[PDB]
Design a protein around this nucleic acid. Structure first.
Ligand SMILES: COc1ccc2ncc(C#N)c(CCN3CCC(NCc4cc5c(cn4)OCS5)CC3)c2c1
Ligand SMILES: [Mn+2]
Ligand SMILES: [Mn+2]
Ligand SMILES: [Mn+2]
Ligand SMILES: [Mn+2]
Lengths: 672, 670
DNA sequence: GCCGTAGGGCCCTACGGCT
DNA sequence: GCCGTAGGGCCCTACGGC
């Protein structure tokens, strides 16, 4: 792995640390092999501030760096044995590259501190605009970053040891709260280098990016960036439900190149989950082929699978090209992407969300669409509605995997505060199997529980004699039969006692820890049920309002063109003679504008008219469309002039969604 | 791995063997877990007919099967201990799935022969049209292939043990010639007999590898993967004048539309075409880490970008001018070129290496100036000899330069298609101080890994197999070029040491020429002249077809312009005719009637925008028509005289020579 | 130790002909 | 034991909450 330099005079040799072999190849080709050694790492490296010594010493990358430097570690550190006088951190020019830099600095500070004190640790500054060093040509990496004549390396300086200790503990330590507090206090939502400043700035950059642009869903459409970009890619390429399935590889490749500069595995897996009926309460992707199972089987390699939008996804994208949502520049400025989707159904709550960010995480359970829309409607008629009254519509979560929820206390607290533990229980019954013997049959399991794994845990309990009475354990699940896990009970043994033991000792009963954090105005916020519904309704009002305004500008523009076309047809002979006598388009246009009192747009539309538009009935067809337009314009102005008419329209469109996509509740909420 | 069934009564139990987890998932979701077990493998399994016994017993997939079947193997085989009465081979419905089936049968016949005799081995028949079982939904896999109610399993039967023995030996054995003879003799361009199954499945695989994978076409010098990559770049306008395009998008597009294989095969093929140490005339312009002479691979495809090189434009030029035949792609949803126009002799220019079945190919790269000069000489003399052609084509010209020793190997290769060419590194002996010397290597033989060659030298020094070497350094840099330094012990003969390096290391390496290419869709060993002849014939056809295409389009456009000219001459009457018509159809009919216009001309008139009536626009229609009449007669002149056509082929080749022709790199030393 | 978006990479097989 | 198109697949790391 270590591509060492030929010289052995440490004082003149330098080692460059890169993320992996893709970056290492450009580095190796562009380097000066006489004084420049290269050591490719393997992505995110172990955080030594959270790990114990045995884990640290046994990590491959740590070991290779220790061996490569030759100084040893901790108390045994010996600066005189350093094989290089420059250790250069040269990670990729992206937030994950910054994160890797903070991880490496954490390791150097805790295990090779005198290396920093001696001024042997440096930070390279590769240019931005590349996804990794492997995207750069070898000559460009050399000239901009590695060549000592032109490069700008940052020498890492330890100014204050006490402050550094606190900085490393706060940022990289196991105490989440202090890291969360640091983010809240420092977040702004919109040559040498001090190690402390470096750690604070690089870590904040990573933390913020994960929070606002990776792990947390937006309250408005319920989507994280990867999912939003996948659905937008599907829309842009017309991969609608009525059209044939499209190759998964083309989808991932398109999305990766145009909108999401990350690994294909993150993109493909996110798309796959959206297609799973055991993961999404209302699947957003319609998949063809092997898309995984409840047993934790992943999907088939993406070259084998195909995908397209589900019908309900069309509602997430409905009106997106009617100036309802703000588009933004993509990562490289070559494309445009939506900041948020119109989302004509409350997707955040319908499908839920799970995400591990930095300083925080989120866990929002899925809900029944009929119940949610009913809740939105009740809210729209009463801004002062209480959580309890909203619960008359929204009983609680509704998992795609069905099952049971025990009581409403966990649900109530989750809806009132955004946090609460909800007890999920499998659907199980006790039945006879012949000869006076019985069995427990499970047909539904808790949400997010891996069936194969749950079964292995039961088998483990039995094998370790931690539970009495089980004689056999079989997974009889099948496509025809549906989920069916069978647990044979010993003759004369109480099956209900065994079942109760199974709930306590296995994931047959599992808790859902609600933690409703979502992005509100681009900032993470813990929200209760009402707040979530209010932000959603407010998004719909804005979407419907902007759509109406777009349709209005569009209709007025068309009315204006038709006024120009009516004049042209009413004076067609003079229009034609005017054009024929003109040498250029400019002269024709100018002459048409003055002579017939036309705007630039009207004259141009006239010049663009094909001879076939001159047929006998066109003039009547034009005044028919014009009359219908004027009416349409009036209808649009009526909506924008009355906020109650606008709101009622939102209610009507939601009700239509409810009636077409609303379904029965799957999860039974049992009380007692 | 093994997803065993519930029941333990081998009587009713069956085990399905699939290629891997992609296929395994659909199989596991669609099966009847009570009686159906599933063991996913990992692609191509070991060929036990060519492998040694120790290796067979150590191979993980062989072990898993033996353990799953529970019978043992050879003399210790026990049919009564069988865990399943039905072992079902269910590979993917593609040629590689057929190959894996032959590999599985070979293992069963040689190590578990009683299993076959007892009727326990079966072959599933999944539907065609799917690249793998992972592409099918679980329900459709169950219904068509796994459901005992509707499935059609083929029970493998052993009729003649002596014939079977010969069959497995011939098809799967280490003797290549017999397998090649079988291919040549049989090549064509329920219950199931094991011998028939082997012969049919292996032949299906062998033929596909030969005509659609490992061998280049004589006309454009390309294998399907390379042709599909370059065509993909063409269809998405990824030309040299535009920006680099993401490699992942290129690969995704090519895989979905044309090349139904692993993305790694596509990416790596594209990468090689961008390497100036691999291609004498690179076909891909790569941005980023595209590998090195030291065997370093390219960066992951998500990091790199690519586009065509300028010379690649010449491979694709006029492809949309009905110069070459298009064919249906693998699923019938797209069209792809059977061959590229290839306006330069690419087979010989870039060469080729491919390992097929029953045969292989090894064609060295050549200098484009020399090649085109050779083609030109041939065009003036159909009876030209190989010797006269060699006055133009001195021999191979590697991208890595270096030296070739002698001309006899080259001569034999050009006359027969086979010959041994000795390549040598470019090395000199120079002083380094105090009476000491060193050997300096600046060019290495073609396809030689520099880092590996240096380690080989380091190994000889270390093991004391070579005398006189005191230091070994790779001083290569992007700014100073290739430089490998071998320091020599003071007063030792550096020339002797160099000669020894040539004997014991790849510093001297041979290139075994074996010029096999597809000629009329069939593999053929060809000599230098044949390669040039087929190439020239391809060019005459391309230029003739292009000229014919240009004529048809010119005449069509002229026809349309004649309609517009009639309309402009009588524009008032045209407008009135249309105005008095209530519908487009009536206008169409009235225009054709009153002005003796064709349907196409009438539609064109109706489609004309009012802006076309301005002075400049009217003049444009007239000007285009007059230019087009001149173009039509020039085209007719070409098609009326075969010598004029042939001369155009010469001139177009000459222009390419002048623009892309370069100096010879490899020195041929007598 | 799992949930799900992220960083990153390696090793087995067939096939022929040359060493 | 390499070369170059093919079949196939796994493991380590951050991050929070429980
Ligand atoms: C699947 O099983 C294994 C097992 C062990 C491995 N060890 C090392 C590596 C590596 N590197 C991989 C490859 C893992 N990744 C690499 C990236 C691949 N994706 C390539 C790709 C393909 C396309 C694409 C983007 N990326 O867009 C359109 S087609 C997916 C597999 C392994 C894969
Ligand atoms: Mn990176
Ligand atoms: Mn439990
Ligand atoms: Mn396959
Ligand atoms: Mn722990």
């Amino acid at each position: 792995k270590l591509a060492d330099c030929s010289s052995k005079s440490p004082e003149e040799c330098e080692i460059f640390l890169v993320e992996g072999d893709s970056a290492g190849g450009s580095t190796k080709s562009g380097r000066d092999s006489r004084t420049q050694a290269i050591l490719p790492l393997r992505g995110k490296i172990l955080n030594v501030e959270k790990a114990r010594l045995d884990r640290i010493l046994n990590n491959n990358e740590i070991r290779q760096m220790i061996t490569a430097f030759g100084t040893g570690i901790g108390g045994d550190f010996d600066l005189a044995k350093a094989r290089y006088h420059k250790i250069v951190i040269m990670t990729d020019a992206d937030v994950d590259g910054a994160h890797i830099r903070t991880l490496l600095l954490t390791f150097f500070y805790r295990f090779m501190r005198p290396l920093i004190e001696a001024g042997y640790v440096y930070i390279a500054q590769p240019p931005t605009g590349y996804k990794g060093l492997g995207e750069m040509n070898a000559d460009q990496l050399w000239e901009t970053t590695m060549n000592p004549e032109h490069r700008a390396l940052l020498q890492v300086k330890l100014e204050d040891a006490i402050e550094a200790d606190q900085t490393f503990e706060m940022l990289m330590g196991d105490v989440v709260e202090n890291r969360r507090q640091f983010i809240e206090d420092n977040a702004v939502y919109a040559n040498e280098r001090n190690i402390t400043s470096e750690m604070r700035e690089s870590f904040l950059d990573y933390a913020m990016s994960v929070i606002v642009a990776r792990a947390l869903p937006d309250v408005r459409d319920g989507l994280k960036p990867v999912h939003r970009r996948i659905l937008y890619g599907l829309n842009e390429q017309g991969m609608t439900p009525d059209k044939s399935y499209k190759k998964s590889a083309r989808i991932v490749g398109d999305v990766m190149g145009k909108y999401h500069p990350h690994g294909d595995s993150s993109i493909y897996e996110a798309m796959v989950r959206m297609a799973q009926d055991f993961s999404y309460r209302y699947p957003l992707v319609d998949g063809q082929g092997n898309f995984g199972s409840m047993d934790g089987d992943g999907a088939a390699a993406m070259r084998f699978t195909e995908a397209r939008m589900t019908k309900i996804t069309l509602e997430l994208l409905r009106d997106i090209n009617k100036d309802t949502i703000d588009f933004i520049d993509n990562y490289d400025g070559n494309e445009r992407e939506p900041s948020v989707l119109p989302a004509r159904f409350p997707n955040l709550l319908a499908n839920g969300a799970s995400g591990i960010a930095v300083g925080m995480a989120t866990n929002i359970p899925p809900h029944n669409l009929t119940e949610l829309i009913n809740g939105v409607l009740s809210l729209s008629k009463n801004p002062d509605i209480s959580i309890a009254e909203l619960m008359e519509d929204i009983e609680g979560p509704d998992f795609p995997t069905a099952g049971l929820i025990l009581g409403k206390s966990g649900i109530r607290r989750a809806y009132e505060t955004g946090r609460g533990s909800i007890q999920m229980r499998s659907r199980a019954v006790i039945e006879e199997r012949g000869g006076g013997r019985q069995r427990i049959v499970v047909t539904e399991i808790p949400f997010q529980v891996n069936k194969a794994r749950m079964i292995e845990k039961i088998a483990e309990l039995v094998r370790d004699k931690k539970i009495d009475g089980i004689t056999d354990l079989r997974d009889e699940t099948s496509l025809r039969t549906g989920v069916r896990v069978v647990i044979d009970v010993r003759k004369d043994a109480n099956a209900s006692v065994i079942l109760n033991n199974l709930y306590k000792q296995t994931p047959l009963q599992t808790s859902f820890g609600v933690n409703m954090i979502a992005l509100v105005n681009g900032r993470p916020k813990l929200i209760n049920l009402k707040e979530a519904l209010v932000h959603y309704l407010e998004h719909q009002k804005t979407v419907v309002r902007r759509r109406t305004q777009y349709n209005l500008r569009k209709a007025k523009d068309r009315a204006h063109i038709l006024e120009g076309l009516r004049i042209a047809l009413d004076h067609i002979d003079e229009i034609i003679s005017t054009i024929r006598e003109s040498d250029t388009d400019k002269v024709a246009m100018e002459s048409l504008q003055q002579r017939f009192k036309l705007s630039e747009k009207q004259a141009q539309a006239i010049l663009d008219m094909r001879l076939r538009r001159l047929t006998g009935l066109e003039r009547d067809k034009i005044e028919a469309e014009y009359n219908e337009l004027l009416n349409y314009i009036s209808e649009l102005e009526t909506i924008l002039a009355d906020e109650e008419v606008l709101l009622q329209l939102v209610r009507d469109e939601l009700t239509e969604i409810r009636d077409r996509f609303g379904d029965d509740r799957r999860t039974e909420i049992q009380l007692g």
